[PDB]
Amino acid sequence: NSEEDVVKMSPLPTVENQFTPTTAWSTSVGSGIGNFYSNLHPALADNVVYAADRAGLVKALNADDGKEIWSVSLAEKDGWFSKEPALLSGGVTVSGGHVYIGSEKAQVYALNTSDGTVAWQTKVAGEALSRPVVSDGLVLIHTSNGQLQALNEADGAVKWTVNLDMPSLSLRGESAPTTAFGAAVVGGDNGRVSAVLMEQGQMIWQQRISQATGSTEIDRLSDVDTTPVVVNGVVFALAYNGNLTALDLRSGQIMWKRELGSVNDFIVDGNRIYLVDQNDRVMALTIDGGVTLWTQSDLLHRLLTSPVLYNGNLVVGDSEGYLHWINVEDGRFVAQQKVDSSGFQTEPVAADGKLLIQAKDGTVYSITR
Amino acid sequence: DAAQKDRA
Amino acid sequence: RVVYRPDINQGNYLTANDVSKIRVGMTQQQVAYALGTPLMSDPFGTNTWFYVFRQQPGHEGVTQQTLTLTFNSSGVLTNIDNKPALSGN
Amino acid sequence: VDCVAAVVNNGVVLESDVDGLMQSVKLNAAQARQQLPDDATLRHQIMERLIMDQIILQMGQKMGVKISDEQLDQAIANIAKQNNMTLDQMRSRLAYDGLNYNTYRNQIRKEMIISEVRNNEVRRRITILPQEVESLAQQVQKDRAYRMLMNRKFSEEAASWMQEQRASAYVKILS
Amino acid sequence: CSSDSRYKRQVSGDEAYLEAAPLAELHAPAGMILPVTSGDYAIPVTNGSGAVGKALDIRPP
Amino acid sequence: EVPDNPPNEIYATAQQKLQDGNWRQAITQLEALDNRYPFGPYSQQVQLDLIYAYYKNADLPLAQAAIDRFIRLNPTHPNIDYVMYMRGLTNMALDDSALQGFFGVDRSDRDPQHARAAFSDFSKLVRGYPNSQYTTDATKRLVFLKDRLAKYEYSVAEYYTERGAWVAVVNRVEGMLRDYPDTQATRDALPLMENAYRQMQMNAQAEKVAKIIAANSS
Amino acid sequence: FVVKDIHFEGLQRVAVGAALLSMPVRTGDTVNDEDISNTIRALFATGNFEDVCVLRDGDTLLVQVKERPTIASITFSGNKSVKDDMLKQNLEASGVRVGESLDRTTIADIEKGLEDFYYSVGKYSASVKAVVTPLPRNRVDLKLVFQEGVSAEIQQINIVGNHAFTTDELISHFQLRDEVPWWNVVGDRKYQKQKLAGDLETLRSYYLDRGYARFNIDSTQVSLTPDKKGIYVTVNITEGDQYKLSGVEVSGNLAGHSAEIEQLTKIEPGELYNGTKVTKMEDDIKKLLGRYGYAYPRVQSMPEINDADKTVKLRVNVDAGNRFYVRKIRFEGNDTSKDAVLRREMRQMEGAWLGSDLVDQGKERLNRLGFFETVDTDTQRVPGSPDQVDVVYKVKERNTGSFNFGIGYGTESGVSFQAGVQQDNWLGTGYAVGINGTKNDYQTYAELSVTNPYFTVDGVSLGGRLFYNDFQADDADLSDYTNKSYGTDVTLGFPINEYNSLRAGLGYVHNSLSNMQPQVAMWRYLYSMGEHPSTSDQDNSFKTDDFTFNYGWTYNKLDRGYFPTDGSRVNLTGKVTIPGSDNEYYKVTLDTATYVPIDDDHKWVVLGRTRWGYGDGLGGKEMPFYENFYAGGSSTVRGFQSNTIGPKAVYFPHQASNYDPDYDYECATQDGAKDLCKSDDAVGGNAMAVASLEFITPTPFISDKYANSVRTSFFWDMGTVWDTNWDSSQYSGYPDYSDPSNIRMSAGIALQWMSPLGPLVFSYAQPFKKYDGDKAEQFQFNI
């Protein structure tokens, strides 16, 4: 009670606005993530916005209006309470006429979109806490048990259950797999990233990047919990405690590494990569050799979100609801916008020349100049 | 490596 | 009478069937395995082991059963006394 | 005049020890040329190499691992066969070279023990997936590609484990 | 009342311990042996001519 | 608590205060001396007068701990027997520490743990240094500790005798005969054989004890 | 070359010759010029030195050594979760302490240990740093800085993998509190792996006792939020299915006692397999075997299960052993109490086969003496022959003497006070002595009491008491309230069984009283006595000599003798007169305090105190007035006053009674004395019934070290006092107190503390329901 002496600092950066943004609309789906950290993020598909909350309600929305299309709740009527929350946590993913929503209750649902019902419901081995990614008639979900499950896109049919290793202090938010040329690039909670083929479930090659040579190994978590990205034949990886690394996809060979690491989510332009440090420090690196292009260490421990490039500008929010427009070159506070007071922990997404963000309670906030 | 004679 | 008397036990309680197996010549170690260490033995010269089976429940006549083992100065039993006690009073 | 170079947990490295590798190497030891950036600039790397050596010796002592004399005999015979030079004549040569026979025995013993310790504790942290072997064989075979795989994986794992010990060990320079 | 006499170089306790009775062993009986020769608290014999009681001028020398 | 000074004046005033007898303060300055100067030239004398002040000030646990610490540091020294003699004295003073003196109560049947510890210490003394100047007092204190142990054991045996636990009495008094064959308490415990064996009907063993009682009756 | 002598620079720890012990040169051997390194390594390998230096600047070898600096003081700050003591013994665990050396690696080891402990509690973003501050003359000092950021908070617990039990029901069961109710401060949301293990074992038991046998915990994860704030605990469970106990078979080296073993084993077929049931059966078997002399049995229950028909065939493994006998009995800690006063309270007799329940019955019995802080059993065996055991009790002595003192009044009365002492274990001999006396210008009273619990060593007790109360109104013996009385009482008691003991005795007391204030009750008593004194004047003097017989009964089972936590007690006493006595009457007193524990730790206890007292006369001769009951104040209903609850005396119209100086003794004197004058003086009747209830909770601001010395009470108390004798005609103008329907109640808190001067009680009373003449007091102090 009297021990609250949190060693931290979150001073406000200078307010600097060279253009004014606007909120096109908001919907206020209701109490969603709340205090709970998870991987919720609204998804869009061809002028149709899909959003959901922890209460089980999933809502299809249109752009430029915010008008409801159809919204159903995922209350467990078959359950003992017949209305108890499903605690939806998987990332919102769209695939044709199918929308995939994961949950922490070892359940993933195949929403059927226009009709409003669910195509099928399957109980998965362990909780599903990563965004479901479809891959050539199959979807992969990173269960928080060291298990990756291959679910048939048409219906159920968990094909292979690969086994990983979980050190018993793994942090939440396990990395999501990436599909490319039959190769899955997925990281585990043990700081080792491996590839598996999406037709039978064979482990191709395993390589370890996280080097936490600290005093206390238990507090040295050093797990890779970010979505990898691939450009041409080289993939990118990040551990919690450092080890930015670019490495060969065909082999277990690392061209080079940047020990700065300490990033949980990042983006790539194809020529300049961007990332967010554990210390909320933005920095650009050269894809050729990891040379520090530039940095802006103005922010420090403000509980930021994922970096997103939009219209030649970098955008990122904070728990305070502030919105930051950061200059593409050398960084600069182009504009600041207190868009909400509920809180932000989800990843922004920009698609179809638009920009999408969700707050803890205000839910969707359409972003436009 | 500098020295020639080393551990076998 | 009128006062409460707790039960008094002052000696290891013996089972006659175990005593039945006892015979002359049966030596100290096997005695220990069969019955156990005698609580009170004779330390004055001869090494004779005493096993007293005595109970005083209270407000009732004491019950007693005296078992005597006589050993030579080598470790082998010589004689047994299965005296039923209850002498006189 | 022999001071103590530094401290390593429960052991120390002393000045004559680095002497046995500064004036006994780099225009000594073998192939006198080697490398000449500068000896003063090289003082740092020789110290770090020797402190790593001492750390591995302490480790090998902690697992209670020892080497008997017969292994040393085979090792010195192998040194003789690769050097294409007879053992007793090498003893006579090192008599004037500045390398005592007993110091030679000690240094060969510790080199063998450090090599075997690092091998034994690295091949546990090296894994082989029976999938990449086929692809690498198709790149160019029959357990031959596994040799290159082993060499490369050892190449990274050695430095990884060395820095692991270095960060997690008590070290401090004295002179 | 008052503390120990001069409160220097004396035992903190009393002195009446000197009134212990003398020691005389119990002789063996006639034609039979005792097991008493099995103890461990044996007192070595020593001479006198030593400070006793208040004569013990205990000081750190 | 005292100003920092060289060893001379501080040691001199501490020793003078010790001669004064004000132990409660003298120990404070002396402890400051020891703490400031851990292994100075005269460390052993510092430990010695620490023990002196502690014992004179009734500091039994601290004094015992300091004794046990010291007896390792200086295994051979002209005062080791003196040091562990004071240790045994502290043990006995711990044993006989109560208000029985004002009321005159024969402390004979309390916990003999401290009596046993002092007995062991003084036996080690008389075995190690029988030629010292403390041997007579050590022997007298061993006599007293023997008497106290014998009296305690005889008290326990007597209690059990009127309780009625005959065989327990027999085993106990056999133990005292085995270990305390010289004391006078056993001489008063001899009839307990007659009390027990006759009550448990082993007169055949009772005649021998009656004979030995008559022999030593004198 | 050849060295002549060796000199050093280290003299603080190493002896002058101890360093010479490790010299291989022996001061008389030529230097090979390579053995120097070997010698240096040998010297440092001792772990005794830091610096080793050799110099031959002359013709001799000089040794320069830097020994470990001596730690002289430890200082540390930033500590909130860890106080001084546990830190001190944690440092001692490594052997690093003031007065000895300082090795640097142990410091880092300590940092790792404290960091691990912080992670254990939840202090994740917290770091320990040791600041080694140098000191002159080869010394150092240590400073510890704790950057205690914030404890970890738990947000969610998941039990995914279940199909038979609701999440909320389970998450209520774990010791961990995932979510505290908003309008409750009952607990917090801390973390502890010890509590995690406890709750997973509790979950295991909760499935295994519901009938599910094929159950196990698959795995468990502890997610950590990427800010070092939140911990999510998730478990993995294989639900399995229920099962039925088909039958249980006993196996192993069981003795002839197998009949009652099977009787215990008697189980209705088809019962659900329960882990708690199996554990209870094993414990019962173990205690049954210990009851017969086998104190070390070997028990294992095998859940032999068919995985096809919902059946289990439990198998009991028994390896009894031998008959274990007690060799001797030893007690430790009875530094002042006589060894006898502990032996006679044993129940497991020395010199027989061990009693598994006799030993613990004796252990609780010694605790029930009431003058022992903690008593603990300890079973240990001889290192020689197999089947022996030594029983040792480590008791600790607590004060058993209560000191009571008071003063006459604030005005300088002079040499007026009350002094005394009550002792239960006087000199540790076991005799109970109670002496106390008072002197005052209004009163002087002193009494003495002696009690022997074991006059004989069987249970028979003896007790006696004396008193003397001739104060004769020390202010003035003329025309004042005079009372002279004294007597002797001797009693004895013996037990009936383990829990019941009655008492009996005899005695005689006479009372002489003169110049009594005129009031209806005592006049009625005198008229019953056959005497008809006057009314207006107060000068009558009467002497009554009473010979009477006492008796009492007592049942007492109680875990502790000083504010216990479990059990109850009754204290009856019957008082009956005998022929030839001046007064013929009978009096009885019922007292009963009841305890009940609500928690396993037995810290929250509801105390039930009830006391009923009734008395009446025999042959038409009523109770003497001085034997009336009272109430109020301490040991009774608390909050109004002592000896003031009950009927109030009323005087006749009173005037010209002997000597009545003005402004004083104005009970009912007045020129205009019209009729009966109401007064607040309460004497009470002969029928009393008081009930009291209180809650017992530990003090919320005390440490465990003195948590046994302080007691907190939430008391609720009611009191009833009335007279069975009444006359409506005389009591026409006054309320009919003979009806016991008038009850007074008060409530509040009271703080109880044990002190070397005796038991200390302070009360904060708040009366709620009151009557006439209560003069309620919110505060009382007593001993």
Residue numbers in the entry:
A (entry chain B): 24 to 392
B (entry chain X): 1 to 8
C (entry chain E): 25 to 113
D (entry chain F): 25 to 164, 393 to 427
E (entry chain C): 25 to 85
F (entry chain D): 26 to 243
G (entry chain A): 24 to 806
What does the paper say about this structure?
The outer membrane is a formidable barrier that protects Gram-negative bacteria against environmental threats. Its integrity requires the correct folding and insertion of outer membrane proteins (OMPs) by the membrane-embedded β-barrel assembly machinery (BAM). BamA is composed of a 16-stranded β-barrel, which, in E. coli, is preceded N-terminally by five polypeptide transport associated (POTRA) domains that extend into the periplasm. Unfolded OMPs are delivered to BAM by the periplasmic chaperone SurA, but how SurA and BAM work together to ensure successful OMP delivery and folding remains unclear. The results suggest that SurA binds BAM at its soluble POTRA-1 domain, which may trigger conformational changes in both BAM and SurA that enable transfer of the unfolded OMP to the BAM lateral gate for insertion into the outer membrane.
Therefore, we created a chimeric SurA-OMP construct by concatenating the mature sequence of OmpX directly to the C-terminus of SurA. This increases the local concentration of the OMP, and prevents it from complete folding, effectively trapping the OMP on the BAM-SurA complex. A cryoEM dataset was collected, which contained a BAM: SurA-OmpX complex in a single conformation, with BAM in its Lateral Open conformation and SurA in its Extended state. Additional density was present adjacent to the Core domain of SurA in the BAM: SurA-OmpX complex, consistent with a short region of the unfolded OmpX polypeptide binding at this site, although the resolution in this region of the map was not sufficient to sequence the bound peptide or determine its directionality. No additional density was observed at β1 of BAM, indicating that the OMP is not yet stably engaged at the site of membrane insertion. We term this structure the ‘Arrival Complex’, as it shows a substrate OMP bound to SurA on BAM, presumably in the initial stages of its journey to the OM, and before its β-signal engages with BamA-β1. In this structure SurA is once again in the Extended conformation, as observed in the Arrival Complex, but the chaperone is not as well resolved, presumably since it is not stabilised by a disulphide bond in this complex. This structure together with the Arrival Complex suggests that SurA binds POTRA-1 first prior to the OMP β-signal engagement with BamA β1. The binding of an unfolded OMP to SurA does not seem to generate novel conformations of BAM, as exemplified by the Arrival complex wherein the Extended SurA conformation predominates and BAM is in a Lateral Open state.
